[PDB]
Amino acid sequence: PNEFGIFNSLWFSLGAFMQQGCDISPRSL
Amino acid sequence: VAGVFYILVGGLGLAMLVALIEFCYKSRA
C-alpha cells in the first residue's frame, strides 16, 4: 500500500538522475 | 565506477525482499 505506475516511475528516476527535484516521493520502506 | 552499479543492483534486490516480507506480514495478520 498507487501513484507510482510505470509512467510515473520513469519520471521519478529521470527526475532524480538529472538532479532536479521529485514531485512525488515514495512513502514505503 | 563499477561498485556504484553493484550497490545499485544490490540495493534493488534488497528492496524487493522488503516488499516480499511486507506483503507476507500484512496479508497474514
Explain this structure:
- This is part of a larger assembly, with two copies of chain A (29 residues).
- The radius of gyration of chain A is 9 Å and the shape is globular.
- In chain A, 41% of the residues lie in helices and 0% in strands.
- Chain A is built from one helix and no strands.
- The longest helix of chain A has 12 residues, at 6-17.
- Chain A has 29 residues and is mainly α.
- The interface between A and B is small, with 3 and 4 residues.
- Chain B: Belongs to the glutamate-gated ion channel (TC 1.A.10.1) family. GRIA2 subfamily.
- Chain B: This is Glutamate receptor 2.
- Chain B: It is found in: Cell membrane; Postsynaptic cell membrane; Postsynaptic density membrane.
Largest interface: A-B, 3 and 4 residues
Compressed to H and E, one letter per element, the order of chain A equals H
Helix residue percentage of chain A: 40-55%
**How many runs of DSSP E, i.e. beta strands of chain A?**
0
Task: Compute the CA-based radius of gyration of chain A.
Answer: 9 Å
Helix-strand category of chain A: mainly alpha
Counting DSSP H or I runs of 4 or more residues, the number of helices of chain A is 1
Distance between the termini of chain A: 11 Å
**What oligomeric state is this?**
part of a larger assembly
Q: Could you tell me the strand content of chain A as a percent range?
A: under 5%
Largest beta-sheet characterization of chain A = none
Global geometry of chain A = globular
Subcellular location (chain A): Cell membrane; Postsynaptic cell membrane; Postsynaptic density membrane
Protein name (chain A): Glutamate receptor 2
Intramembrane segments (chain A): 4-19, 20-22
Organism (chain A): Rattus norvegicus
